[PDB]
A paper describes a structure:
Clamp loaders are pentameric ATPases that place circular sliding clamps onto DNA, where they function in DNA replication and genome integrity. Because the sliding clamp is a closed ring in solution, it needs to be opened and placed onto DNA by a separate ATPase complex called the clamp loader. All clamp loaders are pentameric ATPases of the AAA + family (ATPases associated with various cellular activities). Here we describe a series of structures of the E. coli clamp loader in the process of placing the clamp onto a p/t-junction.
In micrographs of the sample containing ADP·BeFx, we observe two different conformations of the clamp loader/sliding clamp complex, both with the clamp open. However, the degree of opening is drastically different between these two states. In the second state, the sliding clamp is opened into a wide, planar conformation (overall resolution = 3.0 Å). Therefore, we designate these two states as the Semi-Open and the Fully-Open states, respectively. As in the Semi-Open state, all five subunits of the clamp loader also make contact with the sliding clamp in the Fully-Open state. The primary conformational change between these two states is a dramatic increase in interfacial contacts between the B and C subunits. This is accomplished by a single pivoting motion at a point between the B and C subunits. Because the B and C subunits are contacting the sliding clamp, this pivoting motion imparts an equivalent pivoting motion within subunit I of the sliding clamp, resulting in the wide planar opening. In both the Semi- and Fully-Open states, there is no significant density for Domain I of the second subunit of the ß-clamp, which is at the site of the ring opening. In the Fully-Open state, the arginine finger of the C subunit contacts the B subunit’s ATP.
Residue numbers in the entry:
A (entry chain E): 1 to 334
B (entry chain D): 2 to 359
C (entry chain G): 121 to 366
D (entry chain C): 1 to 368
E (entry chain B): 1 to 360
The structure:
């Protein structure tokens, strides 16, 4: 985890409520990946488990502070899936629930952090319902998610929903330029592909995934003028189908914006590719391709154990079929 | 011993329950007339009072002042049930305890006489989350329980319950609370708690909570937590990220004339202001509905938005009803699909751009 | 950092007796989390230990000679089991420390520490029957032998006996899913109306095992209320058995 | 006093009490009269149709002290402890706790023992479909031939989940769901027997509300009695179920068909003040629309009820061609499906009705 | 006044009283008379086909004072002790009861000890395919070199789950499911001997409903007698079979294709009285239509699963153009899509069938 500069005012807007004694026991933070919600949860937990706070901040070397730094605080709770799995089971939250019944070991607060509420199995959510609704005295909860709508309705009904607004685009561009050094168009592409999340832009740049984006761009430079989208297979099928499909769908979206002329698009680093996509493709075909790409990305994200390669190959074959004249194109309905 | 609005204002008598009169009347008359079932399933959406009504029924059933529809609230049993420390009221979470040994625990526990109260009451929450093993093994104990055992069930959705489970229990459907009932409850709570409030803020909070009082109280607590503990219109609007009719009307008039430049620029500006895309689509659908209203009957037009009725009437006049219906359907489908999009802004842009190509 | 809310300087054999009186009547992984433990209560010169699980109650109220403020805490099952595992039959003056959240015990050269269950134990006084009019006084060992004899054919999944109380004879009748009957008769001295009352023979046998006396007295009210069991010549500890439906 | 629940108090105790299920009643009575008592029975039906009660009645008939009679004859000791739930010959076994063969074997090794004061040791293995395949094949041998004193009564809801091998060695009896008239007749019996005043319309609504079982009908009747003060009325039953007055929804569908907007607006904003949930308004309208569609299919599909508005059903069927009915039903169904995402439930219902108006097949809304 | 169950009262006692399985009976007789009996015989058939009856008769042939032969005798000591189920060394084991390798090993520790009576120690294991792999391997290891007077009899409904290696150790017999003629004749003989009034059409209905199993035929005969007071007429069997009818989806497809609205309404009301889930009914209707399309593509698309209603399916495939099949499949697909949001699904399924009938 790491702290972010723009991230301070929200922390000040929550820790003040907690010092007033009127803070909700269950705070649900909605934030995109890389936004820094884990930073808020960890800092707030350190403040809560701190014995004598110093200006709503962790006070150096307190016994609570010492046990927080050591990571073995008896009254601190972390709920994360086992590293060999991506779901939080019934027993992981059940042990938390049954061991929360006892008093705080140090006589202070009892703070619980669920790393990602989206990963919670519906059974784990239903188990946590009772403890969220009526927690014992001096018990506080922290949940994080990309989108609260994906959560269980009765789960989020018991928590105060805080929102982490992404920083202004110019400020985010300045931060990215300070961290990584490249052209501003690449920074804009990363930001608008990351839905305004600069941490996700750092994650994209630091890894090799941006080079894979460049590879996909080249494969599209050959793919759209010849109707050879199947060749994009190797560009998409490397354990990152959601990300590559997101970039492709965003390229299609930018071409569609180029049709209904817009001042701003996402893929500003490749204007020529966007122009080629707009010129060589019918707008209805672009609609169908973008919708099918989004649906396939959703299916890849949702279903576990699915074959990425077969789905991407079928997607490419369907795009090829859509390219032919006289084909009936899908439209979202019902 | 601070408590948040919801639990701090949990109903304690049948007179403190907002709405749900159709089940409260039957419950009180069953308590008074001596007709008491052994199994009650209170089913409804979140934050409508299933747990509260179940606890009130538990209080009334075993009050030592006799089985009454109006529990005293000062007796030993009433206080112990209110605090949750009563032994004869066993509160079980079905998801937490869905196992063969837990079912056997229930089956051999129901055989012993109650320790303190008149009846041994089992309050199971989210009952639909039991396993089929647990449902089938608990059929008899819900069909013909002992004379001193009564069961209370509470599920968010009865459809996931076995139909044979539904057959052997008393179905209490809790309607989602009306906007006026919710707003009056917020007004009463804030007056009793000496918190300043504004009627517009209460209306916004009531509309934001989709007929659920717990959601209304959580949004209220958020409103107190932002803006020095006052429920004001500005604070509620900033918290909910809502926008007035001007921006949504400009968006709709841009979209209906297929002005891609204006629609895209307005969406960019809306993203810059950090507005709620879901709220933007909600205002879209509301304005389209009011356009169709004006189209149907000239007098069926709102009076609050008199400043923007000038363009409103013109747009309602110049657009066929079928096109308005198509725009409404497209925006509704986009709102439905919004959570599953790669980005919320990306999804709403998809919806609006699809609406443009009409 | 410790603020001793309640400090006992008590013989370790005394609390050994206290816990052994009420250890068996305890809840294991019960839904009611406050019952997964044992209540320590302090009233003047009297130390009380209460333990229940919804079917049994065991209270042991013993004077200690030292006056302390009234208090009530719940120590979890694991803590008291560990204490018994460590507690021995010696003369070391045990020292109990009661704080807001934790239990501590200085025992000779050992230290035992545990947390406390955050909850309120139910009032045992109302659990005890308020009209203990009927009295069955009989030798403890004879009752133990009779109950063990009647429980010979009782199954683990079906453990329960019916007591028929009459002018003098006490009848213990036991059935089984195999549908075979066992009956025992005792010459307990009694005077009252004939009655039939069913209890789990395991709980009654445990109650008798906790009573190391020559004879016991059972206090009874009616066929649907709980039954109290106590020493016929002492009032240091009482037990409550909730009847079973027939 | 106590007023034991209708289901518990009014559970059948004789073959002269069970309503419906004429086939299984005749089979049991005739077989007991002829003395051809099979050792394995499979009562299969939906919930609340009488499998458990009929099985208890058969067990009573088998072990009457007077003799082997078709119906449970003069209720002697055995019969009256059976009806009290006390064991004379009824080993009631939930199959969910004995799915494993390690427990089915324990069940089987106890069967070879004479019953106590009874002529049979009647096993009631309920929800028998919940057993495991290993357990099925384990108790297969005992099913094919049990001891003379052991009878098997298996009751389950879905016989398809059963293996065909166990299905072979069982008398299969399927219990049809009871008709609404039989349910209403039984409820009227109960209310006359309980000295509680009742209204015919309320009983008809309750009987329709139950989906073919009398358990749901009895639970609903208890809820309606609680809603009242020891009586059931049309007002109380309608408020309990939430169904609105058919005149309102029928006027609304009429106005939608006639393609007038003002009447639709008046009807909807009057229905707003009556406290009827909007989704049920849409459900009632869709139900009516399908009712007219079925009337179009055949005059057989009108309904014994809905007589107060049957003439208008027939008139709407005559006037409107099936294509328009299909269009209206599709529009209303799509609107109901879209309702959760509308700005307001009333907003969604109003927009759905206005959409049906705008795309009216014959009189669409005027366009500029 | 016995009136015992006709199933076991009429179990075969001599090999000449077994209906069908003629080749198996001939092979057993030839092995018993002239050849040396194989050390292990496995039986595989359908439910209620005769497997355990044949195995018990073979065990009776093995142990008898007349010697190891096909038709040994009547009312002898060993034959009677087997027929009464009281035979000592005729071990009867349910494989599902003893799938554990430990219980199987304990069972296979008994082969060494000599038989208490007769000549051969016969083991009869039912549903042998359910044995665990370790237990199955142990069974093969004890079957490779059995004692000179120890023999194994195995039965299973589905032999496809048995590993191929079982063929290396035991001689297998497959019993063919009885046709309508054999079942009808055997039921006629049983009724004639029991003095039960009956009609040939009632017997034909019973045999067709039996679906090849004679135990099913006997159970249905018992139910027909119980309901009909011994008078087994055509109408009684027809009505009581209609009470057990579950071919509703197929009849719905047939009537909807024939544009028979009243028939579809009667059948859907009957299905409602059956308390069948509507989503399952619609998905199995979709499956039936898909199967019709596939068997239209190629006659081999059908299997033995639908070998009960294959005649009507072949007729439907022959008579219905593929375009109508595609239209009906699309209509039912959209009906299933719109079913959850419809009113009470009893009428949603109705109106989906209405839309299907509209394509007339
Ligand atoms: N009918 C009601 N009257 C008053 N408050 C209510 C009502 N319904 C819900 N609430 C509020 O919601 C909070 C949670 O209510 P609860 O009864 O647990 O809803 P649920 O049915 O979803 O379990 C209560 O603490 C109370 O503040
Ligand atoms: N045929 C019937 N006649 C009368 N009452 C019935 C009948 N079937 C069901 N009931 C009602 O339902 C209650 C429970 O019926 P039950 O026999 O348990 O159904 P199940 O077959 O699902 O176990 C009975 O007490 C009775 O009131
Ligand atoms: N070929 C047959 N001849 C005579 N009776 C048979 C025959 N097949 C089945 N049966 C009848 O069915 C009953 C059970 O037969 P069984 O051989 O156990 O079938 P399975 O093959 O399923 O084990 C027998 O008691 C007998 O009445
Ligand atoms: F939040 Be509630 F119990 F649906
Ligand atoms: F036994 Be039934 F399904 F209620
Ligand atoms: F005994 Be069979 F296989 F039905
Ligand atoms: Mg609740
Ligand atoms: Mg067999
Ligand atoms: Zn500190
Ligand atoms: Zn009270
Ligand atoms: Zn009798
Ligand atoms: Zn012989």
């Amino acid at each position: 985890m790491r702290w972010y500069p723009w991230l301070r005012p929200d922390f000040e807007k929550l820790v003040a409520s907690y010092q007033a004694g009127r803070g909700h026991h269950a705070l649900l933070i909605q934030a995109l990946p890389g936004m820094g919600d884990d930073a808020l949860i960890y800092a707030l937990s350190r403040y809560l488990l701190c014995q004598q706070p110093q200006g709503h901040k962790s006070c150096g070397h307190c016994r609570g502070c010492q046990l927080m730094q050591a990571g073995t605080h008896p009254d601190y709770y972390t709920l994360a899936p086992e590293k060999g799995k991506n779901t939080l089971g019934v027993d992981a939250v059940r042990e938390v629930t049954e061991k929360l019944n006892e008093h705080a070991r140090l006589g202070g607060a009892k703070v619980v952090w669920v790393t990602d509420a989206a990963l919670l199995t519906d059974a784990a959510a239903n188990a946590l319902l009772k403890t969220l609704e009526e927690p014992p005295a001096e018990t506080w909860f922290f949940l994080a998610t990309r989108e609260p709508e994906r959560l269980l309705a009765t789960l989020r009904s018991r928590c105060r929903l805080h929102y982490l607004a992404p920083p202004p685009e110019q400020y985010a561009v300045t931060w990215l330029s300070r961290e990584v050094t490249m052209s501003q168009d690449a920074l804009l592409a990363a930001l608008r592909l990351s839905a305004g999340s600069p941490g996700a832009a750092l994650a994209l740049f630091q890894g090799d995934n941006w080079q894979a984006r460049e590879t996909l761009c080249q494969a599209l430079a050959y793919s759209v003028p010849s109707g050879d989208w199947y060749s994009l297979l190797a560009a998409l099928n490397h354990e990152q189908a959601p990300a590559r499909l997101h970039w492709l769908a965003t390229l299609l979206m930018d071409a569609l914006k180029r049709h209904h002329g817009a001042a701003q698009v996402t893929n500003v680093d490749v204007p020529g590719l966007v122009a080629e996509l707009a010129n060589h493709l019918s707008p209805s075909r672009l609609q169908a391709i973008l919708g099918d790409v989004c649906h396939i990305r959703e299916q890849l994200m949702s279903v576990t154990g699915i074959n990425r390669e077969l789905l991407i190959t079928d997607l490419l074959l369907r795009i090829e079929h859509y390219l032919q004249p006289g084909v009936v194109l899908p439209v979202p309905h019902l | 011993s601070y408590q948040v609005l919801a639990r701090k204002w949990r109903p304690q008598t049948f007179a403190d329950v907002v709405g749900q009169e159709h089940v409260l009347t039957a419950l009180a008359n069953g308590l008074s007339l001596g007709r008491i079932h052994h199994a009650y399933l209170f089913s409804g959406t979140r934050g409508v009072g299933k747990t509260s009504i179940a606890r009130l029924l538990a209080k009334g059933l075993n009050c030592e002042t006799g089985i009454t529809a109006t529990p005293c609230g000062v007796c030993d049993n009433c206080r112990e049930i209110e605090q949750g420390r009563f032994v004869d009221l066993i509160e079980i979470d079905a998801a937490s305890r869905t196992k063969v040994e837990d079912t056997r625990d229930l089956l051999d526990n129901v055989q012993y006489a109650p320790a303190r109260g008149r009846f041994k009451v089992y309050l199971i929450d989210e009952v639909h989350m039991l396993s089929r093993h647990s449902f089938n093994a608990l059929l008899k104990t819900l069909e013909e329980p002992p004379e001193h055992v009564k069961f209370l069930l509470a599920t968010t959705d009865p459809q996931k319950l076995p139909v044979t489970i539904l057959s052997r229990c008393l179905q209490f459907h809790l309607k989602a609370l009306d906007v006026e009932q919710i707003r009056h409850q917020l007004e009463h709570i804030l007056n009793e708690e000496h918190i300043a409030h504004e009627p517009r803020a209460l209306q916004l909070l009531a509309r934001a909570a989709e007929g659920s009082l717990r959601d209304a109280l959580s949004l209220t607590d958020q409103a107190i937590a932002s803006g020095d503990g006052q429920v004001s219109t500005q604070a509620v609007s900033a918290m909910l990220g809502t926008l007035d009719d001007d921006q949504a009307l400009s968006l709709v008039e841009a979209m209906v004339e297929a002005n891609g430049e204006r629609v895209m620029a307005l969406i960019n500006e809306a993203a810059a202001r950090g507005i709620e895309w879901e709220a933007l689509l909600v205002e879209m659908l509301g304005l389209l509905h009011r356009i169709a209203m004006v189209q149907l009957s000239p007098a069926a037009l709102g009076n609050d938005m008199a400043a923007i009725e000038l363009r409103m009437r013109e747009l309602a006049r110049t657009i066929p009803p079928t096109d308005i219906q198509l725009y409404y359907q497209t925006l509704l489908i986009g709102r439905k699909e919004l959570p599953y999009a790669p980005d919320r802004r990306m999804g709403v842009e998809m919806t609006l751009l699809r609406a443009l190509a009409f | 950092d410790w603020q001793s809310e309640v400090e006992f300087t008590l013989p370790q054999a005394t609390m050994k007796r206290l816990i052994e009186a009420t250890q068996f009547s305890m809840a294991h992984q019960d839904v009611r989390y406050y019952l997964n433990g044992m209540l320590f209560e302090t009233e003047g010169e009297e130390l009380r230990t209460v333990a229940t699980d919804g079917h049994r109650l065991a209270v042991c109220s013993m004077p200690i000679g030292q006056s302390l403020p009234s208090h009530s805490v719940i120590v979890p099952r694991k803590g008291v089991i560990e204490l018994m595992r460590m507690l021995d039959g010696g003369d070391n003056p045990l020292r109990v420390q009661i704080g807001s959240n934790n239990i501590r015990a200085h025992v000779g050269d050992f230290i035992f520490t545990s947390k406390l269950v955050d909850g309120r134990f139910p009032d045992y006084r109302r659990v005890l029957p308020k009209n203990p009019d009927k009295h069955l006084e009989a030798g403890c060992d004879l009752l133990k032998q009779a109950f063990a004899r009647a429980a010979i054919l009782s199954n683990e999944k079906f453990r329960g006996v019916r007591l028929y109380v009459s002018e003098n004879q006490l009848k213990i009748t036991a059935n089984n899913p195999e549908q075979e009957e066992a009956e025992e008769i005792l010459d307990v001295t009694y005077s009252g109306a004939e009655m039939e009352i069913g209890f789990n023979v395991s709980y009654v046998l445990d109650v008798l095992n906790a009573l190391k006396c020559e004879n016991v007295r059972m206090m009874l009210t009616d066929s649907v209320s709980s039954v109290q069991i106590e020493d016929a010549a002492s009032q240091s500890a009482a037990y409550v058995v909730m009847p079973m439906r027939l």
